[PDB]
Design a protein around this ligand. Structure first.
Ligand SMILES: Cc1cc2nc3c(=O)[nH]c(=O)nc-3n(C[C@H](O)[C@H](O)[C@H](O)COP(=O)(O)O)c2cc1C
Ligand SMILES: [Cl-]
Length: 306
């Protein structure tokens, strides 16, 4: 039945994840974080923002989660070592609701994949998932997914495109169905934005077009997070202010906030609001551009009071 926010570098930081939950996503994946950064990290409870932060040696917050999403956030790591991957899982397993391993390079070596994943399943008590592209040959694709399954992972997400297949090329619902059918564990359909998904109801269509257990949406949610809302799309302005509010409440860095709003604006980047956003050099300026200066001064004061 599940609507899932797909993992997305830069986009899937905490504000977007909360925003996606508000509009009706059941599960939110975070951006890919690399094991080699995460293993340098320290877990720190931030009583000011009421978040759990994981901080790097240069004092940067690498990953930030919070109570509202603790039963729904899936942590995705990029990794090519089973011992390193377990170490990262151990660091976060208490503050997250699942561990995902990216595979779209790693996809080449099935042995390494098998090692990493079984180490995680035996290693943590959270549902281990993974996300793959499809192989150029269907026989191999089917072989791959079956090896991956017996490692005891909770589910698998299939981006129905082959490595080095450009996004313009249609997603192959047919292979995702093949996969979904063969395996005993849930399959998560992925790859259907723009082509199949422009409106909420399109998601269940895609579910059926692929026989999958659920649907994982990226670009469509990046363009308008209210794509998870069954009642229909919200006006982009309303969504963007909602986004900014979260971003200010959780002290998001303004370059990240700006990046996400640009992905939302797109064509409308040439409106005066868009030009103001492009030009912003701080969160204050981002809020000004959307009539949220009041909100910014008010929320900043409560936060800087520790
Ligand atoms: C901005 C952006 C960043 C992405 N970052 C990641 C990432 O960190 N991890 C990942 O597994 N896939 C990443 N993806 C790919 C998506 O998760 C997904 O495979 C694909 O976009 C699904 O197709 P769809 O957009 O049609 O739903 C990214 C996609 C976009 C648009
Ligand atoms: Cl309305």
């Amino acid at each position: 039945h599940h609507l899932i926010l797909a993992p997305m570098v830069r986009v899937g930081t905490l504000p977007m994840r909360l925003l996606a939950l508000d509009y009706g996503a059941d599960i939110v994946y975070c951006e890919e974080l690399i094991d080699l950064k995460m293993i340098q990290c320290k877990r720190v409870v931030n009583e000011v923002l009421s978040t759990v932060d994981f901080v790097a040696p240069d004092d940067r917050v690498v990953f930030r989660t919070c109570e509202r999403e603790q039963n729904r956030v899936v942590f995705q790591m990029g990794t090519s070592d089973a011992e390193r991957a377990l170490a990262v899982a151990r660091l976060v397993e208490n503050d997250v609701a699942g561990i995902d391993v990216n595979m779209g390079a790693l996809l080449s070596d099935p042995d390494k994949i098998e090692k990493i994943l079984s180490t995680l399943v035996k290693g943590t008590r959270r549902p281990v998932t993974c996300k793959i592209r499809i192989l150029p040959s269907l026989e191999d694709t089917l072989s791959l997914v079956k090896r991956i399954e017996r490692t005891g992972i909770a589910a698998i997400a299939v981006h129905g495109r082959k490595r080095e297949e450009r996004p313009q090329h249609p997603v192959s619902c047919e292979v995702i169905k093949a996969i979904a059918d063969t395996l005993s564990i849930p399959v998560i359909a992925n790859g259907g934005s723009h082509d199949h998904i422009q409106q909420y109801s399109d998601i269940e269509d895609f579910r059926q077009a692929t026989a999958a257990s659920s649907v994982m949406v990226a670009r469509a949610a990046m363009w308008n997070p209210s794509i998870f809302l069954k009642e229909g799309l919200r006006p982009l302005e309303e969504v963007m202010q909602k986004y900014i509010r979260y971003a200010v409440q959780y002290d998001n860095h303004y370059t990240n906030t700006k990046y996400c709003l640009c992905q939302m604006l797109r064509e409308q980047l040439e409106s005066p609001q868009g030009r103001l956003l492009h030009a912003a050099q701080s969160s204050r300026e981002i809020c000004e551009a959307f009539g949220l200066g009041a909100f910014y001064e008010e929320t900043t004061q409560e936060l800087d009071a520790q």
